[PDB]
Curated annotation (Swiss-Prot), chain A:
Family membership noted in the UniProt record: Belongs to the SNF2/RAD54 helicase family.
Highest taxon in the source lineage: Eukaryota
Cellular localization per UniProt: Nucleus
Quaternary state and interactors: Interacts directly with SFH1, CSE4, histones H3, H4 and H2B, and via its N-terminus, with RSC8. Interacts with LDB7, NPL6 and RTT102. Component of the two forms of the RSC complex composed of at least either RSC1 or RSC2, and ARP7, ARP9, LDB7, NPL6, RSC3, RSC30, RSC4, RSC58, RSC6, RSC8, RSC9, SFH1, STH1, HTL1 and probably RTT102. The complexes interact with histone and histone variant components of centromeric chromatin.
Additional free-text comment from the UniProt record: Present with 1990 molecules/cell in log phase SD medium.
Species of provenance: Saccharomyces cerevisiae (strain ATCC 204508 / S288c)
Function: Catalytic component of the chromatin structure-remodeling complex (RSC), which is involved in transcription regulation and nucleosome positioning. RSC is responsible for the transfer of a histone octamer from a nucleosome core particle to naked DNA. The reaction requires ATP and involves an activated RSC-nucleosome intermediate. Remodeling reaction also involves DNA translocation, DNA twist and conformational change.
Protein name listed in UniProt: Nuclear protein STH1/NPS1
Swiss-Prot record, chain B:
Record-annotated SANT domain positions: 6-51
Protein localization: Nucleus
Subunit structure: Dimerizes via the C-terminal coiled coil. Interacts directly with HTL1, NPL6, RSC6 and the N-terminus of STH1. Component of the two forms of the RSC complex composed of at least either RSC1 or RSC2, and ARP7, ARP9, LDB7, NPL6, RSC3, RSC30, RSC4, RSC58, RSC6, RSC8, RSC9, SFH1, STH1, HTL1 and probably RTT102. The complexes interact with histone and histone variant components of centromeric chromatin.
Source domain of life: Eukaryota
Miscellaneous: Present with 3380 molecules/cell in log phase SD medium.
Known role: Component of the chromatin structure-remodeling complex (RSC), which is involved in transcription regulation and nucleosome positioning. RSC is responsible for the transfer of a histone octamer from a nucleosome core particle to naked DNA. The reaction requires ATP and involves an activated RSC-nucleosome intermediate. Remodeling reaction also involves DNA translocation, DNA twist and conformational change.
Full-protein interval shown: 305 to 355 of 557
Annotated protein name in UniProt: Chromatin structure-remodeling complex protein RSC8
UniProtKB/Swiss-Prot annotation, chain C:
Oligomer and partners: Component of the two forms of the RSC complex composed of at least either RSC1 or RSC2, and ARP7, ARP9, LDB7, NPL6, RSC3, RSC30, RSC4, RSC58, RSC6, RSC8, RSC9, SFH1, STH1, HTL1 and probably RTT102. The complexes interact with histone and histone variant components of centromeric chromatin.
UniProt note: phenotype after gene disruption: Heterochromatin spreading downstream of the silent mating-type locus HMR.
Localization in the cell: Nucleus
Miscellaneous note of the record: Present with 2330 molecules/cell in log phase SD medium.
Organism: Saccharomyces cerevisiae (strain ATCC 204508 / S288c) (Baker's yeast)
Record-given protein name: Chromatin structure-remodeling complex subunit RSC2
Primary role: Component of the chromatin structure remodeling complex (RSC), which is involved in transcription regulation and nucleosome positioning. RSC is responsible for the transfer of a histone octamer from a nucleosome core particle to naked DNA. The reaction requires ATP and involves an activated RSC-nucleosome intermediate. Remodeling reaction also involves DNA translocation, DNA twist and conformational change.
Family listed: Belongs to the RSC1 family.
Swiss-Prot record, chain D:
Cellular compartments annotated: Nucleus
Note: Present with 4460 molecules/cell in log phase SD medium.
Top-level taxonomy: Eukaryota, Fungi, Dikarya, Ascomycota, Saccharomycotina
Known role: Component of the chromatin structure-remodeling complex (RSC), which is involved in transcription regulation and nucleosome positioning. RSC is responsible for the transfer of a histone octamer from a nucleosome core particle to naked DNA. The reaction requires ATP and involves an activated RSC-nucleosome intermediate. Remodeling reaction also involves DNA translocation, DNA twist and conformational change.
Name listed for the protein in its UniProt record: Chromatin structure-remodeling complex protein RSC58
Binding partners and assembly: Component of the two forms of the RSC complex composed of at least either RSC1 or RSC2, and ARP7, ARP9, LDB7, NPL6, RSC3, RSC30, RSC4, RSC58, RSC6, RSC8, RSC9, SFH1, STH1, HTL1 and probably RTT102. The complexes interact with histone and histone variant components of centromeric chromatin.
Portion of the full-length sequence here: 252 to 302 of 502
Superkingdom of origin organism: Eukaryota
Amino acid sequence: LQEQSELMSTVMNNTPTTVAALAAVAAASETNGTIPKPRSSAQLEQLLYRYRAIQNHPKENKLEIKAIEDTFRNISRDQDIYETKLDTLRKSIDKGFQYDEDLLNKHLVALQLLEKDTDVPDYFGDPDTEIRISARISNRINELERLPANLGTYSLDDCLEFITKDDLSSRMDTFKIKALVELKSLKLLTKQKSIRQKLINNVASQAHHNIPYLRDSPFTAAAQRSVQIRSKVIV
Amino acid sequence: ENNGNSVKKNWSDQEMLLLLEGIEMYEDQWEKIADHVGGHKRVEDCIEKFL
Amino acid sequence: IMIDAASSFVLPISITKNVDVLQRTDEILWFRGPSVIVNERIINSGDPHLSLPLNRNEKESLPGPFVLGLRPSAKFTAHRLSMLR
Amino acid sequence: SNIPDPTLPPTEMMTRFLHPNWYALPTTVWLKYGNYNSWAPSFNENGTVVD
C-alpha cells in the first residue's frame, strides 16, 4: 500500500514523528507485501536515513528497526564486496588491446539511443497492433505535458555576446520552441490525415487522365470510349 | 524575430512553430495561415510543407 | 476579466525638454501599473542552500548574486576569442 | 480547437479507397432462353471491352 511513498509523504508534510506510519503487526506488514529493498540512488535511501534518525527517541514503539538495520548491514556488505571486486577488476587489466574507434562510435550511439527509449538500427487493417501505436503516441503526449513552461537555454556561444545583469540575449528559447512543435504536431496528427484523405482521394480517384501509361491502355481507352455510348432511338 | 529569413525551403523553428499555431487557430483558410508565418511563404508551399 | 484595455496614457502638455532617459513614443508613456525589477533571469536549481538536503542556525553572506547566475570562467571566453581570429 | 484526440477508434485511414485498377468493367452478358433453344443468339454485348 505504497510503503515507500507513505514515508515520502510524511517527510514532505513535515509530520513524520506524530504517526510515523504506525508500524505494527497489522499495518507495517500489510503495506510491505523486511522492507522490499528499494532500488533508487538517494531519493529513497535518505528517506530511510531520516526515518532512522527520527525514531531514535521512542526506541521501543517500532519493531521494524531491526529489519532496517539488517538492510543497512546488507548495503554495507554489498558496498564492501563491490569495492573488493573493483580492486580485483583494476588489478586484472591487460596491458595492451588497442581498442578501435569505429566500434566505440558504434557502441556510444546505440547506448545513447537506448537510454530514452527510442529506435536504433542494427548496422552490425490489423487493429491489434494499432492500439500499441496509439499507446506509444499517448505516452509521448503525457510525457511532453509534464514539462515546465519556464524552460530556458544556455549555449556555449554566449560568451561573445557579453550578457550583462539586464541584457536579454536572443538564445534563451531555443529548446522551448522545439518542446512545443513536437507537442502540437502530435495533436495535429489527426488533422493532417483529413487533408491527406482529401488529397489522395482526389488525385487517385480518376488515375486515368494524367497518368499516360494507364490512359494509353487498350482496355482503359476502350472502356472510356464505350461508357459514353448514347442510347439508340427507335424509328 | 522580425527580420527577413534566409532562402526559401529552409523552415527554421519559428516558421515551423507559427504554422502549427495558425492551424490550431483557424483549421482552414490557408490565406490566413500563410501570413501567420510572416507572409514570405506561399499558400501552395505551406501546404506542401505541412503534408 | 478583460484583455483589450488601454493601459497607456500620455499627458497633452509636452514637457519633453529634459526627458530623454525614459521610454518615449517616437511624449511620455504613463502606465496604469508600476515596473518590476528582476535581478537574474536564470535560477541555479542546485547550490544546496536552496535545495536543502537532509544531511547535517548558520549564517553565511555569499559574495554577489552571480553564484546563482551560472557565470562561466574567463578562460573559455579567452579561448573563444583566440578561436575568433 | 475542435480536433479529436489521436487515441480515437477511427484511425484506419484507408477504408473507402477503391482504386481504379480494381473497377468492374462491363463484359459480355450471357443470356438464357429455355431448355430447348440451341439456334438463338446466346449472349449479348452492347458496350463491352473484352470478347
